[PDB]
Motif scaffolding. Structure first.
Motif, short mmCIF file in Angstrom:
data_model
loop_
_atom_site.label_atom_id
_atom_site.label_comp_id
_atom_site.label_asym_id
_atom_site.label_seq_id
_atom_site.Cartn_x
_atom_site.Cartn_y
_atom_site.Cartn_z
N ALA A 29 -15.97 112.42 48.18
CA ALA A 29 -16.24 111.03 47.82
C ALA A 29 -17.30 110.42 48.73
O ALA A 29 -18.15 109.66 48.26
N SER A 30 -17.26 110.73 50.01
CA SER A 30 -18.20 110.23 50.99
C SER A 30 -18.92 111.40 51.66
O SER A 30 -18.75 112.57 51.28
N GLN B 97 -18.66 112.28 54.93
CA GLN B 97 -17.97 112.93 56.03
C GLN B 97 -17.55 114.35 55.65
O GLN B 97 -17.64 115.27 56.46
N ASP C 202 -7.64 112.87 51.16
CA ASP C 202 -9.07 112.71 50.95
C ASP C 202 -9.35 112.09 49.59
O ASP C 202 -8.64 112.32 48.61
N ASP C 203 -10.41 111.28 49.54
CA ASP C 203 -10.93 110.77 48.28
C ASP C 203 -11.95 111.76 47.74
O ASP C 203 -12.87 112.18 48.45
#
Lengths: 49, 49, 220, 49, 145, 48
Positions: free
Chosen positions: C131-132, C134, C145-146
């Motif tokens: 999603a991000s 990181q 986690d996304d």
């Protein structure tokens, strides 16, 4: 300008369409791309235009 | 705590909220801003460190 | 110790929607028999109204790389970002897939997400992406986690559609962040775990707790 | 901006279609990019509106 | 094979200054357990091509070789392996596939056995050293056992 | 380590590409050799 933009977009997509020999071979990527293009542009819209 | 290594969550002591980023609203993405307003939220997100 | 999702683990696909300045959490659900389409079951008011969590459970049957999936189609593992996952509906034993039909009137490029009987084809395969920034491809998917799920068959995001009054789920070109919250990984043999269906026998006296038969005066 | 979109689409057309035959490598990439940025399709082919 | 040797050397260097039940040792054991099947395939490859040189030297094989030139037949090599009852059926099939049989099913076994003997021996020794190190520094681990 | 991980992923992808094919052609062999020389150098650097 608007008509020309949409005509150019449709031309670009139609040219991105896969080749007939690939479609006959049944390549998965070619079939997927053709499906995506069909989803974007309905047949009725083309016929109406 | 170490510079660069440690990952820290900022928390408001009195309220307990967590320092996090607000949800980017529309038309700001359209303008092109790279700045996300920061806010204090009960849950925040996972990458608030 | 951070925990990693692994195949053969039960999960719930959860998403967040802000309504009336109040965050509300929803789980992807479907019945399978009678209705193949997926809907969203709220799970934020659980402390007042329990959610119908039975039909929200998916088993991670397989997780291959994109190329491994390509080879397989042409013919307990950890989940790694960029791999393609296969999900069985726990109740109906059907597979979460991207359907060709589309009931949405607002969106014309979006397809319906539902269950299908067979695992054949590429419609039942989804690729997980961070999603991000990181997380990155090749990393192990850590619980909480996304992640964004992309359909292998149509390159569409598993998307939360708020266009209408009600909240719906479909496969579109706008992305939505999901959480694969774990339900169970592996139960020690013979031990009871939450979410099991079972019978409550009075001691060992071949008497079970029950309710009255159907069409009874006590209204069951 | 239809009038600028038309020039960009013309360039992509020349990039994806060569000698009367589609170039699959460029066509697939272009289709994927266009769907990943749906605003390229113009307001008419937008998702909701 | 050379790249594989370099990888194993890097792992052994990681195991320098090791202690019993050390963190690096435990993590390397976990890595091997995670990649168990591939390690098993590697070990099978090495042991096959190590036993090959022995059987080729074994007089039983040299006896099964009737052809004066030395090249036994693809059907005849199958017999030599059958005699030692060492390699299993599929293993013999794989050895035949790797045999590089000539147009007349002729196998210069001297060359067959000597093809990998050096790199195979080197990497096998390094892998044996790695496994011995891990076994002696992580004494109680059924997964390693 | 990060570069090594990227290289390993690329090599695994390239292997998966050549997995079905019975034999590897000359350019494939050359690309494997290049990637493998680079990986060998990286492993030597880590050992050092």
């Amino acid at each position: 300008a608007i008509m020309s933009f949409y005509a150019a977009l449709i031309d670009l997509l139609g040219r991105c369409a896969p080749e007939t020999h690939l479609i006959q071979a049944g390549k998965g990527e070619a079939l997927r791309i053709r499906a995506i293009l069909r989803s974007l542009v309905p047949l009725d819209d083309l016929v109406g235009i | 705590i170490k510079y660069g290594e440690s990952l820290c969550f900022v928390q408001h002591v009195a309220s307990g909220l967590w320092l996090t980023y607000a949800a980017p609203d529309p038309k700001a993405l359209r303008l092109g801003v790279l700045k996300k307003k920061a806010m204090l939220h009960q849950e925040g997100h996972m990458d608030d460190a | 110790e951070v925990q990693f999702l692994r195949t053969d683990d039960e999960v719930v696909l959860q998403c967040s929607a802000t309504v009336l300045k109040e965050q509300l959490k929803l789980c992807l659900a479907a019945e399978g028999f009678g209705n193949r389409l997926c809907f969203l079951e709220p799970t934020s008011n659980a402390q007042n109204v329990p959610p119908d969590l039975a039909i929200c459970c998916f088993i991670l049957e397989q997780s291959l790389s994109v190329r491994a999936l390509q080879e397989m189609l042409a013919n307990h593992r950890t989940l790694l970002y960029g791999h393609a996952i296969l999900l069985r509906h726990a109740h109906s034993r059907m597979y979460l897939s991207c359907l060709t039909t589309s009931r949405s009137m607002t969106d014309k490029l979006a397809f319906d997400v539902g269950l299908q009987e067979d695992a054949t084809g590429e419609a039942c395969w989804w690729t997980m992406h961070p999603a991000s920034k990181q997380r990155s491809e090749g990393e192990k998917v850590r619980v909480g986690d996304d992640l964004i799920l992309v359909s292998v068959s149509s390159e569409r995001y598993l998307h939360l559609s708020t266009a209408s009054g009600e909240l719906q789920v479909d496969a579109s070109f706008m992305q939505t962040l999901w959480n694969m919250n774990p339900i169970c990984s592996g139960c020690e043999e013979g031990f009871v775990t939450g979410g099991h269906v079972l019978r409550l026998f009075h001691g060992h006296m071949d008497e079970c707790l029950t309710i009255s038969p159907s069409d009874s005066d006590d209204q069951r | 901006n239809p009038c600028g979109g038309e020039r960009y689409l013309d360039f992509l057309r020349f990039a994806v279609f060569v000698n009367g035959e589609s170039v699959e490598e460029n066509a697939n990439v272009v289709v994927r990019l266009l769907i990943r940025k749906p605003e390229c399709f113009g307001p008419a082919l937008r998702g909701e509106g | 094979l050379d790249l594989q040797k370099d990888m194993v050397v890097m792992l052994l260097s990681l195991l320098e200054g090791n202690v019993v039940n050390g963190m690096i040792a435990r993590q390397m054991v976990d890595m091997l357990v995670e990649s168990s099947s591939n390690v098993e395939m590697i070990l099978k490859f090495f042991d096959m091509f190590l036993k090959l040189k022995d059987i080729v030297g074994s007089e039983a094989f040299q006896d099964y070789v009737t052809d004066p030139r030395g090249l036994i037949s693809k059907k005849d090599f199958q017999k030599a392996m059958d005699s030692q009852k060492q390699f299993t059926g599929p293993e013999i099939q794989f050895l035949l596939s790797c045999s590089e049989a000539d147009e007349n099913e002729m196998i210069n076994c001297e060359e067959f056995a000597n093809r990998f003997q050096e790199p195979a021996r080197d990497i096998g020794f390094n892998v044996a050293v790695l496994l011995t190190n891990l076994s002696e520094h992580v004494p109680h681990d059924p997964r390693l056992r | 380590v990060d570069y090594l991980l990227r290289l390993q992923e690329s090599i695994s992808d390239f292997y998966w590409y050549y997995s079905g094919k019975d034999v590897i052609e000359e350019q494939g062999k050359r690309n494997f050799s290049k990637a493998m020389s680079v990986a060998k150098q990286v492993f030597n650097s880590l050992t050092e």
